[PDB]
Design a protein around this ligand. Structure first.
Ligand SMILES: O[C@@H]1[C@@H](O)[C@H](O[C@@H]2CO[C@@H](O[C@@H]3CO[C@@H](O[C@@H]4CO[C@@H](O[C@@H]5CO[C@@H](O)[C@H](O)[C@H]5O)[C@H](O)[C@H]4O)[C@H](O)[C@H]3O)[C@H](O)[C@H]2O)OC[C@H]1O
Ligand SMILES: O[C@@H]1[C@@H](O)[C@H](O[C@@H]2CO[C@@H](O[C@@H]3CO[C@@H](O[C@@H]4CO[C@@H](O[C@@H]5CO[C@@H](O)[C@H](O)[C@H]5O)[C@H](O)[C@H]4O)[C@H](O)[C@H]3O)[C@H](O)[C@H]2O)OC[C@H]1O
Ligand SMILES: [Ca+2]
Ligand SMILES: [Ca+2]
Ligand SMILES: [Ca+2]
Ligand SMILES: [Ca+2]
Ligand SMILES: [Ca+2]
Ligand SMILES: [Ca+2]
Ligand SMILES: [Cl-]
Ligand SMILES: [Cl-]
Ligand SMILES: [Cl-]
Ligand SMILES: [Cl-]
Ligand SMILES: [Cl-]
Ligand SMILES: [Cl-]
Ligand SMILES: [Cl-]
Ligand SMILES: [Cl-]
Ligand SMILES: [Cl-]
Ligand SMILES: [Cl-]
Ligand SMILES: [Cl-]
Ligand SMILES: [Cl-]
Ligand SMILES: [Cl-]
Ligand SMILES: [Cl-]
Ligand SMILES: [Cl-]
Ligand SMILES: [Cl-]
Ligand SMILES: [Cl-]
Ligand SMILES: [Cl-]
Ligand SMILES: [Cl-]
Ligand SMILES: [Cl-]
Ligand SMILES: [Cl-]
Ligand SMILES: [Cl-]
Ligand SMILES: [Cl-]
Ligand SMILES: [Cl-]
Ligand SMILES: [Cl-]
Ligand SMILES: [Cl-]
Lengths: 829, 829
């Protein structure tokens, strides 16, 4: 159900029209001389009933059956017979652009008791109506290009009534295959054996664009020539009903490589110098595509993506170029020039030629363009909205250039596409919308949004935008999966809008403020939610879910954690803290995970159907272009010999406290026989530390913490957190001596009251014990010093004390389960 | 490989002993009059070769085969023949406790060219050696009780040499089934049809304890009587080689329920009052277990978990009770009393009886006990370490009582078990170690650690502790999975140590400081890492992974997010912010997910093998006990009519700034025709807001933000972040007027310089555009006010400005990608 939702049911009903009964499809009646592109779509619908039911819908040319699905254009014999007998409201289609009419009617023809009619105003309107039914029975436009499975059915009925999508609001609506190496090129080679895009590949692109209800394509042009590499390319597009175009610097239906490949035979591409050969270039161009409905790019820039002393009389060079471009069209097409659709794209030295009134002939479409990052540059004023030929918009989902290429994943928030396209429509630009899609994949969702907006931008607003995302998800994964799948698509798109993967690195986010950890943790949360959903899917759904959701999310969550880890590696390495080695390991592991994930996408997902599609490098950019060998491991640093890199931590106060994890001492003096032993992971946070073993005297032992406090401070509250050890050796309890060396020192008895005596047993004892820790505080007078450095000192007086955390409190203390983030520190010897 | 690692290979070798060749196991030779418990283990080993190879190892009674695995005790005929011919070092086993000897020997007996010998010093030492081989060939002790699959093999050889575990350091090592309703009781009923634990159930518990190398059990005693409910219970334990005991208040081999069930027939349980019937109770107790090696609890507390005016002569009551308890043992056992192992547990009014020297007879074991939360209360002094009978330790992994029961999941950090048990051993307590395991599951890992420490505590230290976890993981999931599986077990155990699930709620963690978000996000990260690992497992491994890792992690990560969400719900509801409704929904969803997860564990995992094991309630505690109906939805609050709950936000400064998300205005005046429209999710953070549509004049419109600043502030820097809209309508750019109403106001032109002119194109233009936002700052003079409240005002002057975020900066501003955490605020009308 693309256009009309909730009219096809999975049970039959007397007051509904049966499309499929106990496995057998209803036959499709078609005029055998129907437009060949419409027959192709009808054949695809016949096979779509095959995908649903197990048997193809018989495609017939005579009303043999008592009930029928009758398809065709207004001019085909059966539709023509229906409008003439007023069985169908033909007035609602005659003259209309790309419109279908879908309605059940009783006794359409003699011998037919009841039929579903799909009548198109023209070729494409018939195709669209057919594919509307295709969706109704459960074949997503993405059934091939993103492996979206078809729910098998045994019976289908459709509600009566008259159904339409009306006419599209934008005349030309399509995509540009661009930035296509190495991905799309690798995939076309692996799949078709061709170092070019041939008509097998392009017809497969055409069916998609048509199922999506678009009509337009700029073919790939980096190393290919859509018109020259295969003579069926133009012929197939013309038959199937795609309008072909060329990009802004490819005038006159010549693909750029047709000139490049023969720079030796051809001249220089300077109109005044090389006029003769270039005019011949242009002519055979229009010669090749006359009798098709292709858009003719007119004008002239440079060759490559460069422009072309100028100013007054240079503007008159362009004027001239358009003039004789049009007589060339006239001499070839036979008709006059305004009978051939033409488009003049504007860029650099043209917005400037705009003001003195450089406009093309009235009939020509003026193709505006975005900034390569989704923001429109110029729009028509109220005065020039008049323009008869109308206006286009070229929009980027993918871009190679400044400030850095973006070639890997979708980077376009849903809100950003809509917010800028709604503006585009509201200012009158509605003749051509074409979006740069990179390799097509993985832009599946923005493409669907882009084209659905081009059909009817009026049905989108800020409140209902994500309703579109939810509908898309329900189509791909089913009603039960839809809310959560759309939620993920929206979120990962938004995260990707924050910074492109190619421009993400260790310095993107703020590390001290905790921002890096937030966005890294939060993307992994999204990955966890996508993993949970993935386990609930039916097997036949996993490949589509991975292509539309799981791989983008996993690959980005992994990329984020990699750079976050690099940022932590450098911080700890600067600080001389051997924990740097852990984060170095994480960088390595996440870097390799990135290759694991793309290897899966290419080689394992869908049995390697998409091998090549996910081979763009992404890690190792140094300039704007991806001209470096391959994904490169971000630089990491390691502390040699990390076991003898202990002690010597000195802290600096921040935000009212000095919070210290107990193992980050400045020095530790061992006892007689018993030695300071750190216990990894023990406690609520970093680790614990204790003299071992517990059978030895602790006499003389001490831990020492070096810290800097602002001179304005006169007394402090010292919190020491230890493990909730009980008084096992001696009922009077465990004591330790805390104090600033050079100043006053109190002793703490932290478990004298942890027992089963009535006043303690439930008031203190069981509560503290079930928490596993005890926290004591002394209040200590801070003496004077000239450098501001102090040495806090912890001296145990009984065995088995497990020190865990210290916080000196001079204002900024916050009650909390983990006893606050550790204060800044670094290491010395 | 439990005891000896890296001696069994998957290929054969001339200098190794073949255990399995091309599918055929080597035969096991056993004396047919061998101890019946040893034969049982040998039969289990025969079937373990079946689990590995597909065919069971033939178990034979004569040396028919040229090569053999020869098992038995020192007294069985074949082992006896080997030690006498000095083929085996019998001196290394005679007298030793529970020791095996495993060694290849050539020509052991005539007609046998080569055999692997497994000789035990006694019954249990033989069993242990057999199960050592069981592990060598790949059968985990957890192959049944946690579904750990057996890697199929076609050939196995074992290295030559002499192999042993020596003797255990703790004489009795076992578990207490306790807190066993509703889980273990439900599972036993579902599995065996019995509202009691019968000998089918207990033998299955025995095989586990033996494969784990323990020898001790306190059976379940809440509603069952191990000795009374089934006469094969004692007989099976005696045959298989388990030492049975009873808990601290179950004297004389009587299970508590044997008294409870007949409170009517029996008397009151007051020794002085009801002496006659209680002595008869005690007697038939010892009568029932004489001729077995069971531990006899002596002493007397109350019935229930309560004690029993006292002081001087009351201590003489206990003295007397022990005295005649021992003559009862003497009159029944025939021998004297010190020939029967006895244990006196100490609790409440006994540590006090301790000081005046209340000690039992010298031969009796004194069973100390922890605090029910893993911390030891008393340990022997150097003077009383002398005690001939020795000392025990009762340790909790599970507990019903103060301050709140803990009955759902493992809560014991690995470090905490070790740190307190290493102390226990070092102080001389090495006769009995028994751990309260709840329902056994899901304590699989702490049980293995506990018992492995009881075998040889000397091999554990702070540095190598987690080596044990890694070895355990490699056994359950394979070398390739081990590091990451152990990492997860360690972490989730640590997190659970921070607070028990039953005591977790909205107020556990600090929300303002971001601590709640940290621990919630971090547990979900652990879940994501466990999910990733789960997808790499072979199918046959998934059930074990879910039981030992995935379900604890998912269930806790979900529980944490639930309470975190509740905490957010209440904060936003207090603040009158309709976002509260989102968090209410999350509480509901996570609450139901908790039931999804346990439904899976019970009913779907392993085809419902474990149905009942995971039915403990956990959500809805109000006191210490789980006496409430069922898991209950934590209380949430919702803002009625949340669409008309906009505007009226007023902010309070914190930490040097006022950070405002653009949609949290105090008031918004609409324009003529164009209306303030908020665009969900748009931008880097909360959302965007803009006058729509863009075709209307914006004259007069404004947003207003109300905020409180400390009176000490005289001027501010105001940062406004908008979308990077370009100057599409008018090349001079977009302008807006920012200022404090009642004070000065500057205007900002944020895109006058976003174009392709040479000085802008790569310096500013492409960088800002690819970032999707622009940030401008004015510096504004702050005027005087008496309440400290100000009204910042944003007035657009051109169409299409997308406001996203504001931060007024008076010191605390931090450069960051998201422009800082939003400042505190609330809502009014
Ligand atoms: O950082 C700042 C820089 O941004 C600034 O650098 C400018 C960036 O913008 C660049 O213009 C882009 C150049 O690249 C064009 O794409 C072409 C398309 O043709 C491709 O050729 C094919 C490649 O694949 C092969 O296999 C095949 O054989 C080829 O036919 C070519 O690879 C691409 O580069 C873009 O469309 C332009 O937008 C500009 O050149 C830079 O100068 O400098 C300042 C610095 O501060
Ligand atoms: O919050 C503070 C409180 O902590 C304090 O409350 C005390 C908590 O400690 C309690 O002692 C525990 C009581 O419960 C015992 O377990 C029994 C075992 O027997 C069970 O009976 C079976 C239940 O299942 C049935 O199906 C079966 O038929 C029964 O046989 C019974 O359910 C359990 O309760 C524990 O072992 C004790 O440790 C103490 O009673 C409380 O007073 O009060 C102060 C407050 O501030
Ligand atoms: Ca790409
Ligand atoms: Ca029009
Ligand atoms: Ca790679
Ligand atoms: Ca339990
Ligand atoms: Ca001993
Ligand atoms: Ca439940
Ligand atoms: Cl087809
Ligand atoms: Cl419509
Ligand atoms: Cl070719
Ligand atoms: Cl034509
Ligand atoms: Cl034409
Ligand atoms: Cl709108
Ligand atoms: Cl809605
Ligand atoms: Cl952004
Ligand atoms: Cl900070
Ligand atoms: Cl670590
Ligand atoms: Cl040291
Ligand atoms: Cl004190
Ligand atoms: Cl002391
Ligand atoms: Cl068995
Ligand atoms: Cl050992
Ligand atoms: Cl019974
Ligand atoms: Cl015996
Ligand atoms: Cl005996
Ligand atoms: Cl030790
Ligand atoms: Cl190690
Ligand atoms: Cl804790
Ligand atoms: Cl804070
Ligand atoms: Cl939300
Ligand atoms: Cl409003
Ligand atoms: Cl300016
Ligand atoms: Cl203006």
């Amino acid at each position: 159900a693309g256009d009309n939702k909730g009219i096809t049911y999975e049970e039959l009903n007397p007051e509904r029209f049966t499309l499929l009964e106990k496995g057998t499809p209803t036959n499709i009646l078609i005029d055998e001389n129907e437009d060949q592109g419409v027959m192709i779509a009808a054949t695809n619908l016949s096979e779509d009933f095959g995908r649903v039911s197990g048997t193809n819908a018989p495609l017939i040319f005579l009303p043999d059956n008592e009930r029928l699905i009758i398809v065709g254009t207004l001019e085909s014999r059966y539709i023509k017979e229906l409008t003439e007998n007023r069985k169908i409201k033909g007035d609602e289609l005659k003259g209309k652009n790309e419109k279908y009419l879908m309605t059940v009617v009783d006794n359409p023809l003699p011998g037919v008791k009841e039929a579903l009619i799909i009548a198109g105003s023209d070729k494409r309107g018939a195709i669209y109506g057919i594919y509307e039914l295709s969706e109704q029975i459960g074949v997503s436009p993405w059934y091939d290009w993103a492996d979206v499975p078809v729910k098998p059915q045994q019976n289908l009925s459709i509600e009566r009534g008259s159904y339409t999508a009306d006419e599209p609001a934008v005349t030309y609506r399509g995509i540009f295959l661009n930035d296509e190496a190495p991905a799309l090129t690798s995939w076309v080679e692996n799949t078709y054996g061709t170092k070019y895009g041939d008509h097998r590949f392009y017809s497969r692109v055409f069916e998609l664009i048509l199922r999506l209800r678009g009509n337009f394509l700029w073919p790939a042009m980096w190393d290919w020539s859509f018109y020259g590499d295969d003579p069926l390319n133009s012929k197939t597009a013309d038959t199937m009903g795609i309008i072909m175009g060329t990009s802004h610097h490819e005038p006159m239906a010549r693909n750029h490589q047709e000139w490049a490949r023969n720079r030796d035979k051809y001249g220089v591409w300077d109109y005044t110098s090389n006029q003769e050969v270039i005019d011949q270039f242009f002519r055979e161009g229009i010669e090749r595509v006359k009798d098709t409905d292709d858009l003719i790019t007119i004008g002239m820039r440079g060759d490559g993506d460069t422009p072309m002393p100028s100013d007054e009389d240079n503007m008159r060079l362009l004027e001239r170029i358009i003039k004789n471009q049009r007589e060339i069209i006239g001499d070839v097409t036979g008709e006059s020039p305004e009978k051939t659709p033409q488009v003049w794209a504007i860029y650099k030295e043209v917005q400037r030629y705009f003001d003195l009134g450089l406009r093309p002939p009235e009939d020509v479409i003026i193709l505006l363009s975005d900034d390569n990052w989704g923001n429109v540059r110029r729009l028509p004023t109220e005065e020039e909205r008049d323009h008869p030929g109308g206006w286009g918009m070229y929009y980027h989902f993918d871009y190679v250039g400044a400030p850095r290429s973006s070639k890997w994943l979708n980077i376009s928030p849903i809100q950003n596409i809509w917010e800028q396209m709604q503006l585009t429509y509201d200012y009158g630009v509605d003749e051509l919308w074409v979006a740069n899609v990179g390799d097509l994949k993985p832009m599946e969702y923005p493409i669907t949004l882009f084209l659905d907006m081009a059909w009817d931008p009026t049905r989108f607003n800020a409140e209902n935008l994500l309703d579109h995302t939810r509908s898309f998800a329900a189509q791909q994964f089913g009603e039960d999966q839809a809310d959560e799948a759309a939620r993920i698509i929206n979120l990962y798109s938004k995260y990707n809008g924050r910074v492109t993967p190619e421009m993400l690195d260790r310095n993107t986010y703020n590390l001290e403020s905790g921002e890096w950890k937030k966005v890294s943790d939060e993307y992994i949360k999204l990955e966890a939610e996508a993993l949970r959903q993935y386990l609930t899917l039916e097997p036949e759904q996993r490949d589509a879910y991975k292509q539309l959701i799981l791989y983008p999310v996993q690959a980005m969550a992994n990329l984020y954690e990699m750079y976050y880890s690099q940022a932590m590696n450098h911080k700890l390495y600067r600080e001389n803290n051997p924990m740097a080695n852990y984060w170095a390991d994480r960088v390595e592991e996440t870097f390799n995970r990135d290759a694991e994930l793309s290897h899966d996408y290419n080689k394992v997902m869908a049995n390697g159907k998409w091998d090549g599609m996910m081979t763009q490098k992404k890690i190792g950019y140094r300039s704007w272009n991806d001209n470096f060998p391959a994904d490169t491991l971000p630089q990491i640093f390691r502390i040699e010999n990390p076991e003898e890199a202990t002690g010597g931590y000195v802290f600096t106060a921040r935000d009212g406290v000095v919070v210290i994890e107990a193992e980050h001492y400045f020095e530790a003096k061992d006892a007689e026989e018993a030695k300071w032993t750190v216990i990894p992971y023990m406690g609520r946070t970093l680790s614990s530390i204790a003299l071992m073993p517990y059978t030895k005297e602790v006499e003389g032992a001490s831990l020492s913490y070096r810290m800097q406090i602002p001179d304005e401070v006169s007394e402090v509250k010292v919190h020491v957190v230890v493990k909730s050890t009980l008084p096992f050796h001696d009922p009077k309890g465990h004591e330790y001596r805390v104090g600033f060396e050079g100043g006053s020192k109190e002793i703490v008895n932290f478990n004298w009251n942890l027992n089963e005596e009535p006043e303690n047993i439930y008031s203190v004892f069981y509560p503290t014990v079930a928490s596993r820790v005890v926290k004591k505080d002394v209040t200590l007078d801070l003496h004077d010093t000239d450098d501001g450095f102090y040495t806090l000192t912890l001296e145990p007086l009984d065995p088995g004390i497990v020190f865990q955390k210290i916080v000196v409190d001079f204002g900024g203390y916050e009650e909390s389960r983990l006893f606050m983030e550790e204060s800044p520190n670094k290491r010395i010897e």
